[PDB]
Design an enzyme around this catalytic site. Structure first.
Site, mmCIF file in Angstrom:
data_model
loop_
_atom_site.group_PDB
_atom_site.id
_atom_site.type_symbol
_atom_site.label_atom_id
_atom_site.label_comp_id
_atom_site.label_asym_id
_atom_site.label_seq_id
_atom_site.Cartn_x
_atom_site.Cartn_y
_atom_site.Cartn_z
ATOM 1 C CD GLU A 127 -2.822 -1.308 2.374
ATOM 2 O OE1 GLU A 127 -2.365 -0.985 3.489
ATOM 3 O OE2 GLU A 127 -3.980 -1.758 2.226
ATOM 4 C CD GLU B 223 -3.756 -5.818 3.875
ATOM 5 O OE1 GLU B 223 -4.651 -5.011 4.208
ATOM 6 O OE2 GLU B 223 -2.548 -5.648 4.137
#
Ligand code: NA
Ligand code: NA
Ligand code: NA
Length: 444
Positions: free
Chosen positions: A163, A351
């Site tokens: 991320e 995720e």
């Protein structure tokens, strides 16, 4: 048949600072998150990852727990401050932990997926400028090369960054994450140096030519909807989509930053870090893309200020983060990648999960039926993507266990396993029992 092939990887995911604890043991030095969590007001009730889930000491129990659930792959991150606790100073004791961790995984038939950087930058690196100092490309490359060399026989699936939108914009512009700056120009330069560091690791990886080994990156992606069909809201959605998604998808997969965002950001800050040579390094071919998906956004035009879209509440059910439960955007994003960015390249959901108000009831169980339904709805969208020709190779639930949720501390529980932090007891939630059945039957 099977909705999910025998080769499809049912996984769970964690990150080093969120679960490991042992923050001052076996040579580990401080990360920017150890420091950030000790600054007043930065983390909920001054929580930190000193102890967290104590996974550093309990890893054998946790691997046995995954084995008994039938977990097929485990995504974790490696703590840079354990491996190089000082600049140029390798720590074999830190490497030894990840060797015994991955040895335990392999011996229990769990495939390791290792995230090289999941936000725990060594404090010595930040003191030298951190992600704002272009020299970090070389420090990160040296770190990544050491991991490839020492763990190549253990780990065959590598993720450079987790991320980078969070490590750049959330850490340097919004300021919610470490090191907590609030400067758009800094966040943009950091985003570039992160991508360049990713590129350096890919270059090193390809030169090593490790047998049967694959490398990728993990991006948190959403879907943006305009609140109305107006031109004002269409531009607002375009900007929000460029801010979250295209600012990273375009340089990685098109070799060029999105020009509408370059011009937009250029009205507020410098964008002179862009050059052809860096974008060539950034856009090197990957083996897979990891997608972190949680929610969508519905936006309407704001005050014509910098990134000031008004967040619209569509009135649907939400998690304890306030994130709308909207499983269709998982399919929409995977399809968007297939049609606009990654085409036939393998995809992983690295995720997906949800924070709910989990309580251990008098029967000793955690009846987290909202999380059962959440995961059921999203895995059904994964199945629909597969049946529509999408190249989805695996799905990692965030998280294996409740853990340190960054600026929220331990107040948000994402696990399929509940952690009683006073005793470090693990309690399988009903969602873990549901997931165990999904892995066993491969039917949903
Ligand atoms: Na920790
Ligand atoms: Na603290
Ligand atoms: Na690629």
């Amino acid at each position: 048949m099977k909705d999910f092939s025998k080769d499809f990887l049912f996984g769970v995911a964690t990150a080093s600072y969120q679960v490991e604890g042992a923050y001052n043991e076996d040579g580990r030095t401080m990360s920017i998150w150890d420091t950030f969590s000790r600054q007043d007001g930065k983390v909920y009730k001054s929580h930190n990852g000193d102890v967290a889930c104590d996974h550093y000491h309990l890893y054998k129990d946790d691997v046995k727990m995954m084995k008994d659930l039938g977990i097929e792959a485990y995504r974790f991150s490696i703590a840079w401050p354990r491996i190089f606790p000082a600049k140029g100073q390798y720590n074999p004791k830190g490497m030894d932990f990840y060797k015994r961790l991955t040895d335990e995984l392999l011996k229990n038939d769990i495939k390791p997926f290792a995230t090289i950087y999941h936000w725990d930058l060594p404090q010595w690196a930040d003191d030298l400028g951190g992600w704002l100092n272009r020299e970090i490309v070389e420090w990160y490359g040296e770190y990544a090369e050491k991991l490839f060399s020492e763990l190549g026989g253990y780990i065959k699936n590598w993720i450079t960054l987790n991320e980078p939108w969070c490590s750049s914009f959330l850490s340097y512009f919004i300021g919610e994450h470490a090191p907590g700056h609030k400067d758009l120009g800094e966040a943009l330069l950091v985003s570039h140096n992160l991508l360049l560091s990713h590129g350096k690791a890919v270059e090193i990886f390809r030169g090593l030519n490790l047998d049967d080994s694959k490398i990728g990156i993990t991006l948190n992606l959403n879907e943006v909807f305009p609140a109305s069909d107006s031109d004002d809201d269409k531009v607002a959605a375009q900007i929000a989509d460029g801010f979250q998604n295209r600012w990273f998808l375009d340089p990685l997969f098109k070799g060029k930053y999105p020009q509408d965002m370059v011009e937009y950001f250029g009205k507020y800050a410098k964008v002179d870090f862009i050059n052809d040579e860096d974008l060539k390094l950034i856009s090197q071919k990957l083996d897979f893309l990891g997608v972190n998906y949680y929610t969508r956004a519905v936006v309407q035009k704001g005050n014509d200020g910098l990134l000031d879209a008004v967040q619209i509440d569509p009135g649907n059910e939400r998690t304890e983060m306030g994130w709308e439960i909207y499983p269709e955007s998982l399919y929409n994003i995977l399809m968007r990648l297939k049609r606009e960015y990654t085409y036939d390249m393998p995809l992983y959901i690295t995720e997906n999960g949800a924070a709910f108000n989990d309580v251990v009831e008098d029967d000793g169980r955690v009846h987290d039926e909202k999380r059962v339904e959440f995961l059921k709805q999203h895995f059904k969208e994964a199945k629909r993507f597969l049946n529509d020709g999408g190249n989805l190779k695996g799905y990692f639930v965030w998280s294996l266990m409740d853990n340190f949720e960054w600026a929220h501390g331990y107040s948000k529980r994402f696990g399929i396993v509940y952690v009683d932090y006073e005793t470090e007891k693990r309690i399988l939630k009903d969602s873990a029992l549901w997931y165990k059945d999904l892995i066993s039957t491969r039917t949903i």
